[PDB]
């Protein structure tokens, strides 16, 4: 339930904040944070390769467990639910009866004090992870691996999930968060339930300052530039686009499909996205 402010400043009028209700611990586990080398959008050559980045809040990266088949059969108690500045989802700290500790991304409905486990034999309950082939057709699921043993790649953002739609041989058919229909291998792990923090998308940033806190520097329209800078540059007074709308680099940015045609994964994508 997003939190709102009274309009005691021009910006507080619209600014909204997460309610941080599910959060039970306000300090990261020390053995699980490492320094996150801020890039500014600049590659190893020193060059901006992703425009308008930098200047946001300092962050420690918390090491997240995206395998989980790492510890088949070893259950763990959900000790805490923590804020993570590096992702939209909240994270859950797990204490394993093993003694080992690690984080997973917090599903919706996870409860501090409940237990979870990974493996072909795990109950179909929230927080448990299984190879895709042992999860009932129809259950929603998150943190899905794309290929076996390669890590969770799909449905990781706040409020997202995939759904098992059926089985076919060594593979099982998922509906990705995008609505795409895709074959994923059945030995790929996933975690029953959807990702928590669903109200994330209802947040209203509120002012220019809030973007800056997040490392988002101001974005400058091509139409505000000159012809040396952008296809949409120049003109006297304001100008319509005068040509098909184009990127800084000249390619068309309305409709033009960009996925590589002869890509091997095409054999595994049943139907391109909706919407």
Phi, psi (deg, nearest 5) at residue 264: -60, -30
CB-nearer residue toward RNA: 20 or 134: 20
Sign of the dihedral through C-alpha 97, 103, 107, 108: positive
Options 78-86, 116-124, 127-135, 185-193: segment touching RNA (CB under 7 A): 78-86
**Contact predicate 111/78, CB 8 Å:** yes
What is the Cα–Cα distance from 141 to 129, expressed in whole angstroms? Answer: 9
> Of residues 223, 245, 246, 253, which one binds Mg ion by CB under 5 A?
223
What is the separation, in whole angstroms, between the first and last Cα of the chain? 26
Q: Which residues ranging from 80 to 119 are in contact with Mg ion (CB under 5 A)?
A: 84, 90
107 binds RNA (CB under 7 A): no
Q: Which residues ranging from 37 to 66 are in contact with Mg ion (CB under 5 A)?
A: 37, 41, 48, 51, 53, 56-57, 61
- Binding partner at 22 among Mg ion, RNA, none, C-beta below 5 to 8 Å by kind: Mg ion
Nearest partner of 156 among 112, 203, 194, 110, judged by Cα:
194
Question: What does the chain come to in residues?
Answer: 275
CB-nearer residue toward Mg ion: 103 or 122: 103
> Of residues 77, 103, 104, 114, which one binds RNA by CB under 7 A?
77
Enumerate residues 6+ apart whose C-beta is below 8 A from 14. 204, 206
- Binding partner at 99 among RNA, Mg ion, none, C-beta below 5 to 8 Å by kind: RNA
Q: Could you tell me how far CA 28 lies from the centroid of its own chain?
A: 20
Enumerate residues 6+ apart whose C-beta is below 8 A from 117. 73, 74, 75, 76, 123, 128
CB-nearer residue toward RNA: 39 or 114: 39
What is the Cα–Cα distance from 121 to 141, expressed in whole angstroms? Answer: 16
> Of residues 117, 118, 158, 192, which one binds RNA by CB under 7 A?
158
Q: Which residues ranging from 159 to 198 are in contact with RNA (CB under 7 A)?
A: 159-160, 163, 165-166, 176-178, 180, 182, 197-198
Options 109-117, 126-134, 149-157, 185-193: segment touching RNA (CB under 7 A): 149-157
The least distance separating RNA from the CB of residue 130, rounded to whole angstroms, comes to 18
Under DSSP, the state recorded for 73 is T
21 binds RNA (CB under 7 A): no
Q: Which residues ranging from 32 to 71 are in contact with RNA (CB under 7 A)?
A: 33-61, 63-64
267 binds RNA (CB under 7 A): no
């Amino acid at each position: 339930a997003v939190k709102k402010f009274k309009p005691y400043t021009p910006s507080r009028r619209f600014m909204t904040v997460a309610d941080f209700s599910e959060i039970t611990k306000t300090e990261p586990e020390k053995s699980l944070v490492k320094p996150l080398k801020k890039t500014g959008g600049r590659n190893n050559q020193g060059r901006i390769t992703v425009r308008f980045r930098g200047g946001g809040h300092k962050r420690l990266y918390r090491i997240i467990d995206f395998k989980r088949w790492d510890k088949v059969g070893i259950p763990a108690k959900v000790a805490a639910i923590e804020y993570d500045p590096n992702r939209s989802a909240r994270i859950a700290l797990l204490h394993y009866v093993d003694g080992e500790k690690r984080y997973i991304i917090a599903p919706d409905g996870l409860q501090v004090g409940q237990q979870v486990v990974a493996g072909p034999d795990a109950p179909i309950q929230v927080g448990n992870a299984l190879p895709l082939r042992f999860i009932p057709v129809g259950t929603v699921v998150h943190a899905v691996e794309l290929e076996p043993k390669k890590g969770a790649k799909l449905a990781r953002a706040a409020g997202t999930s995939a759904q098992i739609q059926g089985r076919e041989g060594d593979y099982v058919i998922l509906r990705l968060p995008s609505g795409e229909l895709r074959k994923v291998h059945g030995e790929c792990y996933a975690t029953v339930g959807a990702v928590g923090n669903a109200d994330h998308k209802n947040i209203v940033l509120g002012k220019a300052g809030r973007s800056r806190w997040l490392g988002r520097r101001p974005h400058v329209r091509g139409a505000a530039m000159n012809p040396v800078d952008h296809p949409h540059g120049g003109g006297e007074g304001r100008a319509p686009r005068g040509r098909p709308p184009a990127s800084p680099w000249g390619w068309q940015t309305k409709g033009l499909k960009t996925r590589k045609r002869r890509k091997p994964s095409s054999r595994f994508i049943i139907a391109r996205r909706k919407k």
